[PDB]
Design a protein around this nucleic acid. Structure first.
Ligand SMILES: [Mg+2]
Lengths: 56, 195, 175, 139, 50, 191
RNA sequence: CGUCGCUUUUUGAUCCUUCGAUGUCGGCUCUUCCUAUCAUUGUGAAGCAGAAUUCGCCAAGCGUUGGAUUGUUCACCCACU
RNA sequence: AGAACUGGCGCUGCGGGAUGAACCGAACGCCGGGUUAAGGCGCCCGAUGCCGACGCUCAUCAGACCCCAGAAAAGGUGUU
């Protein structure tokens, strides 16, 4: 079997709203530059960033 | 102009839902022979939920209050009434293009009547399940015109079996009259494009 | 899982990451019925983590491919083994179907466990599936179609309402 | 009462769906509401069609249960269905219903003018029978 | 008296079962009351002899 | 389950000839004619074969409680062969203590007028379903006989006497009084 | 011995509404409603012989009084039914 | 009745939950086009007027959509 390299880039969009949001999980959206609903950003895939996307 | 719906073999609310949409849209609808409307569920169940409706009555005087109609023309009329916005003037006029009758009156015994396959009992019930006629759930509760209606219908239906006698007398004639000759030149172009 | 639409079979193999203690782990194989290849590699880690000490952070899948049937045009008999959860306890259950394809019989099961037992698609596990032959069937709804020169009519036909004219002068005959 | 059954070989029409208007032959039933059919000479290959989508005719075909594509094809043409189908009064109704559907604006003029001509001639020769009817009943 | 006619009338009057819940009068080889009022229960007892 | 069909067949002797209008069954025999309509029961009736006259009632598909109704067709049909070739006869005897139960017939068998039921002054005029008639028996005490072609018209009418002679406000474990049926037989025998 | 409930005609518990005010017991008068039926209709079961009782069922149609003591609600007694 | 963490209401309209402080979506300058969220599409009432798929279910007290606005033990040769 050949298993390839798990990817280095990811595209993240925000599918939820601004209001009723926990204080850890709105700091990271502020760090992903995901402030409005339906805003997108490319994200470098890293262990430090994979655990940021699991918070949110 | 006006659609004329023969009411028998139909269900109560499936027919009343289609009439209450055709009459907000500006049509005139005449529902005829409401005595033969079916209603699903066995007869004792539909007769209970009309007797439960009768005890709804405002305490201080029943003269003001819920008007419990008893003829099946008005039972079906109040079913259509509850599917129309009858407290607005767009819905007041909607109830007034509906002339629902009982039996078949002399304007309407000589018009061709349509049915609604979306509300027929044969289409819409599964045949191993029971149904109630609106004619004898009206009769069991206070309606006093069942026998004088059935008398006039069997005199109405007898005047049409002599109409259908002589209508197919003409159809036998003009099928033998089209047997003859020399109209083959016109049948060249009608058989070619759906006779 | 939601089990949306027709399902789809997947062969999902995978191994855990090579430790200083065990180079070359044995790399197990499963047989996942799932709507797409993202839920399939998710449910691979649901069952493997029930049997081994493997989990997705300490493992990787090495192949997830759709395995499809080798005879789509052959009428087969599928008896399958279930492990659904009920409201009181949980139950083991053998349950036959009959379909042209392997993946559509297990679709027909989720549609049938939800229908007869109100069992949602998450509280149900598929133990194994195989084609069985006749004279090894138990269920008479499946058994009655094992009939050379089978024949039946279609009584009381009804279809195509409002697509025709909603108002007509013609009572529709049901054959 | 129930003069036509589903059966291995029963040639069915297809009313709606993505194979509408073409014939099939019932090869095998699977369970209660779907059936494996094919049309080998009418361009609808082997697949499972539901029964409410199909449309039973009076044609049977004799071939063994759940055969291959070839032995249905030999049975389709040893019986010669496609010639015998088109010479029946229901294949002529489905053909005429799409002759009227493609009747253009000039052709619908010609269907008009050659209709009111023959409706005169039939109404003359049906009124010349009304006069002939009372003259019989005058004695 | 007529002891054959005694046993004939006792076929319709005494040789029956009585439900402990719906209090019906069923038939002497019942297992269930036939009435929906008791949910077709299965605790019966024979009719009490003289 | 929705099973593939079930069917019972009815062997029919030659002295009875059955026609069918549909789910109506017309049964003509020696001692009259009688008909039933099964237009509520959703089945097909096909009488097959010359010279033998088999009647096969079969119900396609069907649920389990509509599988229970194909046997009810053929059992009502056999009771129309039986009733029109042999008749039905329910012999009912009068079981009474101290008070004799006096019974007469007013009108041609159609009215049974029971009096002196357990010392009572009130008469009991029980009219019968049309098609049956009565007879006070011979060579047996206190017996009444009911004869007719339709089993539902004999037996319902037999139940109208047995319900009319009902003891009120008393123990019915003693006070065994009434006109109960004794036998379920035919008018012509041994055939 | 247990154990699951319902009801809001008991009493609490709570403190939501009302402190620029919702007139606070009882009786009398009068109308309606409920059924968890005391009696009357039709019924089934008794350890129902009859008489009398008893226990269930459909059922609120129609009745459910006259008094002595007591401010009584409640009580208790006399008498009729 | 009293605390912990977070969000909200108070200060906040809007779509939905028929109704509504707090539920669910989403926060708001004045408008046109487009598309959706939660929820829905027999008729009130916009939209299934799809030739929608598979089953289950008959109630003489049927069932019917978070919060949420009514039920339990026990039982049924009722049906699957
Ligand atoms: Mg949430």
């Amino acid at each position: 079997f050949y298993v390839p390299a798990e990817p280095k880039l990811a595209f993240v969009i925000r599918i939820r709203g601004i209001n009723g949001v926990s204080p850890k999980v709105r700091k990271v959206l502020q760090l992903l530059r995901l402030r409005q609903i339906f805003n997108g950003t490319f994200v470098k895939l890293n262990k430090a960033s994979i655990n940021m996307l699991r918070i949110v | 102009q006006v659609l004329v719906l023969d009411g028998r073999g139909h269900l109560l609310g499936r027919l009343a839902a289609i009439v209450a949409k055709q009459v907000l849209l500006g049509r005139k609808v005449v529902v005829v022979r409401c005595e033969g409307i079916n209603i699903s569920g066995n007869f004792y169940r539909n007769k209970l939920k009309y007797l439960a409706f009768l005890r709804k009555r405002m305490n201080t005087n029943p003269s003001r209050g819920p008007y419990h109609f008893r003829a099946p023309s008005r039972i079906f009329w109040r079913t259509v009434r509850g599917m129309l916005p009858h407290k607005t003037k767009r819905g007041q006029a909607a109830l007034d293009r509906l002339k629902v009758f009982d039996g078949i009156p002399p304007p309407y015994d000589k018009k061709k009547r349509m049915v609604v396959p979306a509300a027929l009992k044969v289409v819409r019930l599964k045949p191993t399940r029971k149904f109630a006629y609106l004619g004898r759930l009206a009769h069991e509760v206070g309606w006093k015109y069942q026998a004088v209606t059935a008398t006039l219908e069997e005199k109405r239906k007898e005047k049409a079996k002599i109409h259908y006698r002589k209508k197919k007398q003409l159809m036998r004639l003009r099928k033998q009259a089209e047997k003859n000759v020399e109209k083959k030149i016109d049948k060249y172009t009608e058989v070619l494009k759906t006779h | 899982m939601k089990a949306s639409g027709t399902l789809r079979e997947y062969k999902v193999v995978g191994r855990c990451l090579p430790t200083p203690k065990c180079h070359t782990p044995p790399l197990y194989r499963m047989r996942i019925f799932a709507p797409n290849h993202v839920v399939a590699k998710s449910r691979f880690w649901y069952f493997v983590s029930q049997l081994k000490k493997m989990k997705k952070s300490s493992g990787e899948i090495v192949y997830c491919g759709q395995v499809f049937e080798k005879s789509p045009l052959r009428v087969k008999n599928f008896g399958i083994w279930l492990r659904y959860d009920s409201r009181s306890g949980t139950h083991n259950m053998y349950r036959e179907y009959r379909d042209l394809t392997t993946a559509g019989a297990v679709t027909q099961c989720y549609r049938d466990m939800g229908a007869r037992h109100r069992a949602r698609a998450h509280s149900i596990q598929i133990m194994k599936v195989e084609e069985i032959a006749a004279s090894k069937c138990r269920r008479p709804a499946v058994k009655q179609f094992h009939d050379s020169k089978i024949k039946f009519p279609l009584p009381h036909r009804v279809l195509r309402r409002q697509h025709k004219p909603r108002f007509t002068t013609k009572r529709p005959n049901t054959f | 009462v129930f003069r036509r059954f589903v059966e291995v070989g029963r040639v069915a029409y297809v009313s709606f769906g993505p194979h509408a208007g073409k014939l099939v032959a019932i090869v095998d039933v699977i369970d209660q509401n779907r059936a494996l059919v094919d049309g080998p000479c009418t361009q609808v290959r082997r697949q499972a069609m539901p029964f409410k989508c199909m449309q039973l005719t009076d044609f049977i075909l004799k071939f063994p249960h759940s055969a291959h594509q070839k032995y249905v094809r030999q049975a389709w043409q040893k019986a010669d269905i496609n010639t015998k189908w088109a010479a029946t009064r229901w294949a002529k109704k489905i053909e005429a219903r799409e002759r009227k559907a493609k009747m253009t604006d000039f052709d619908r003029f010609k269907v008009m003018k050659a209709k009111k001509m023959r409706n005169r001639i039939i109404k003359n020769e049906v009124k010349k029978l009304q006069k002939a009817a009372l003259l019989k009943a005058s004695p | 008296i007529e002891p054959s006619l005694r046993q004939l009338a006792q076929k319709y009057n005494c040789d029956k079962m009585i439900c402990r819940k719906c209090y019906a009068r069923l038939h002497p080889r019942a297992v269930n009351c036939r009435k929906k009022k008791c949910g077709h229960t299965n605790n019966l007892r024979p009719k009490k002899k003289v | 389950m929705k099973t593939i069909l079930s069917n019972q067949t009815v062997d029919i002797p030659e002295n009875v000839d059955i026609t069918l209008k549909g789910r109506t069954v017309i049964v003509k025999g020696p001692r009259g004619t009688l008909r039933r309509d099964f237009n509520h029961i959703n089945v097909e009736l096909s009488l097959l074969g010359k010279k033998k006259k088999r009647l096969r009632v079969d119900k396609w598909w069907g649920n389990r409680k509509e599988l229970a109704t194909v046997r009810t067709i053929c059992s009502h049909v056999q009771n129309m062969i039986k009733g029109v070739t042999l008749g039905f006869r329910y012999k009912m005897r009068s079981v009474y203590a101290h008070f004799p139960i006096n019974v007469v017939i007013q009108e041609n068998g159609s009215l049974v007028e029971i009096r002196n039921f357990l010392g009572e002054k009130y008469i009991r005029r029980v009219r019968m379903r049309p098609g049956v008639a009565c007879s006070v028996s011979q060579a047996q005490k206190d017996e009444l006989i009911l004869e007719g072609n339709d089993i539902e018209l004999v037996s319902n009418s037999a139940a109208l006497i047995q319900q009319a002679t009902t003891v009120k406000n008393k123990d019915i474990r003693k006070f065994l009084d009434g006109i109960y049926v004794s036998e379920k037989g035919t008018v012509q025998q041994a055939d």
